[PDB]
Symmetry: D2
Subunit: 227 residues, 4 copies
């Protein structure tokens, strides 16, 4: 049975992955700082902004001889703040969760894949804000741009070991007047849903994605096509 | 049953779509200038650089009530000529097949979908050369960049009518020493195959792609990630 | 003195180059289909959609020994028509002017540069519609994406002969309530002007641009930054 | 005279900016963690202020701004040229080192940019920021996870802050250099094989020099760049055009 590690598991996209992949017979390691909305399911309570906590997670996984075959980096925070009111710590904290955690989680799984000869695969959940900016999101935009780059780099780094690394860039996804604004910035007059991102994860981890690495799949209703 | 029109049907990616989609119970209209390598299948021998033959084909299909639900623009040519020896006609012809035909085919199917309120979708087969240039490929590069732009523009044009328009950008696909230079430009030490593109076409016309429009799906073994 | 050939010379960006570079002691060959808004200036009346007229233009220049050192492809047309009303001839005409003429003109000056060992340079005037789509502009969008791709390819092609090829992508330039929609789509509350493009041209054809080829310079008041 | 604050002033691109802008009569604020190559200049009466600072330390950046405010120095222009670049397999890239690259290459540009913009918005001044990214902000390479991530990030940051401050006439742009011969890349130029590999990945058979970047900075901060914001100007000899 494939083991899949999923960050941000308590909410939104990450949460919608849990039920779905458990139902397809995956063993699931769920990571999140909350667990209130959470079968071979291991739940870990972890603040992914703390690199020491990640490192203790991995010591505990190596002691239980448990290593995932697949990593989904779906934890994310989004500041909602004018840039002049964005503190040094809030900027860093967004970068810690949105970029540093995926880096560290990825380096750790990849180390274990390379040593065992496993053909792992990683899916990074970025955003349309990884390709286009928006007001009041200096840290979110920067971090999501970074994660797209990281995805491309790690694909190159680990490709000769058959480890695939790709990203998904969601547009407006409905989760945990405005609507008019959303519609006039999209081509389609519909909302994305979590399951639209889950199906793309499913495709990107499948055998049918064997030649796919370093790619960013945009799932945005047309947001990024233009103005 | 759904009708899917597929250009470049006689060879490579378009040919691999024919049988695959026949086996999934699609009715198929196959377009190609050759037919030597070609069940509800209609085969049309057509030179897609001739816009008047395209116009006639649509008149015929309207009289037979055989207007497609899905269009796959997979016909393509690539020059292999230094730019100083690339004649006006060679440049025009590559543009006529790789961009003008997809434009006309798309406008025609979309005309019919807006009249009849059908939720059709287009998949355009672009190339990594639509993102990164190469030597001796001025027309191929220009037309593939153009086709990515066209995909964006038509996604926006028709989104309110729930017609989705997407592109796939293949890397080196094995179709009808150099092997080492390919591995050198890729992250993965494997060859893309027609089926890697067919599975992506299949995902992009499926219900699970309902929120996907204007997007370009790169399927290239890491080619475009970097150097 | 350096000779600079400028297309689209009767209007907007190309016209603004004429006086400016004449005043800087360039010899100028001006190309346009009209001449009413038109010293070592050579004016040529020419329909750049007509490929044989371009061939005749070069036949004339070779007799006069007037081969340019610098080419600025500023001729352009943009359709204003919904895509379903965009005819085959009109799509092809936009393509022939916006892409094919830059290609032919570029290949012919590059041929002369390579024979004479001259360090030529080309500047292609693309558009923000070369990066992002908009409604009712299928041809304009496709053609300007194409031109960005052509610029990248010809830079690679001719790099070893020290021929530089770059592009400029203007946003809203004032040339020959809507004013508020333009402000909502830009970061700056000002209008672009032809001189903004002309100064970039002047930098791109200077000795200070020795290491600049294949690049696309965006001059758009923030239009392409996001939404 | 204009005041221009330049990070990475001790070496490379930043040093060449210090020299170039001093020669054109700007008042220069030079920021760098090292100062050996600025000592001679500090002994003259050139209008050069040198601050020794570790830009990876956010509290030290805050102390910089306390010092600038006490000395009445508000720059008109910020050049974020300080940057670092690891050369290491990703599996050997430690948490602290990934973060140090991010801190210098991203966080510091963000903090310095927010602070200058804050003072420009209060005083109604038309400021200008130029961020030095990299071709690695567009195309990845092996053994550069932090560098590639950071440079991608800085391009994004550039676009975001352009949009944020555009109504206040604060322009924010980036430059993405390819291979520029400076102290950071001087390794490469004695190695004949690596020179071939660089030439093979470029369209032009030359190298960039620090002045190719200084000239672009001069353009982007001029009146002739009044309509340019959020943009990224690639200066790479054709590196990024393709393969
Ligand atoms: C976009 O799409 C992706 C999914 O987000 P969504 O739309 O599902 O929104 P969401 O807010 O519903 O999901 C984000 C999840 O990430 C988790 N998270 C945030 N900070 C964390 C931390 N420090 N440690 C562990 N977990 C943390 C949250 O608790 C939450 O459960 C994200 O990557 C986002 O940026
Ligand atoms: C890439 O991927 C896609 C498919 O490539 P492939 O690997 O299958 O290549 P391929 O060369 O094996 O297939 C290309 C097909 O396009 C067809 N085609 C070329 N000119 C045509 C015309 N004028 N009218 C009708 N059909 C024409 C060819 O005959 C051929 O069957 C293309 O868009 C290509 O550029
Ligand atoms: N030389 C190149 O080929 C090249 C290529 C792409 C991008 N770049 C970018 O250009 C910028 C400058 O590069 P360079 O070639 O001049 O490098 P350099 O190393 O010669 O100069 C960088 C300067 O930044 C300073 N710096 C580094 N960390 C710092 C810290 N914590 N606090 C204060 N100062 C610090 C250094 O001490 C140094 O003086 C960097 O952002 C680099 O990433 C350079």
């Amino acid at each position: 049975n494939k083991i899949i590690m999923i960050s941000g598991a308590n909410s939104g996209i990450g949460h919608a992955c849990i039920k779905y992949f458990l139902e397809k017979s995956f063993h699931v390691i769920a990571l999140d700082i909350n667990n209130n909305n959470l079968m071979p399911l291991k739940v870990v309570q972890i603040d992914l902004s703390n690199s020491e906590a990640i490192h203790n997670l991995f010591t505990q996984l190596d002691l239980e001889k448990l290593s995932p075959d697949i990593l989904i980096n779906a934890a994310g925070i989004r500041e909602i703040t004018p840039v002049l009111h964005l503190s040094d710590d809030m900027f860093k904290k967004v970068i810690d969760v949105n970029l540093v955690a995926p880096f560290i989680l990825s380096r750790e799984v990849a180390k274990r894949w390379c040593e065992s000869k496993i053909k792992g695969c990683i899916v990074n959940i970025a955003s349309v804000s990884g390709l286009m900016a928006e007001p009041e999101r200096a840290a979110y935009v920067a971090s999501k741009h970074a994660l797209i780059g990281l995805t491309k780099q790690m694909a190159m780094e680990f490709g000769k070991q058959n480890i695939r690394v790709n990203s998904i860039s969601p547009g407006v996804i409905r989760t945990e007047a405005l609507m008019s604004m959303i519609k006039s910035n999209q081509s389609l007059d519909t909302w994305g849903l979590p399951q639209d991102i889950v199906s793309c994860i499913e495709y990107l981890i499948s055998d049918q994605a064997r030649f796919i690495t370093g790619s960013n799949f945009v799932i945005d209703g047309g947001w990024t096509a233009g103005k």
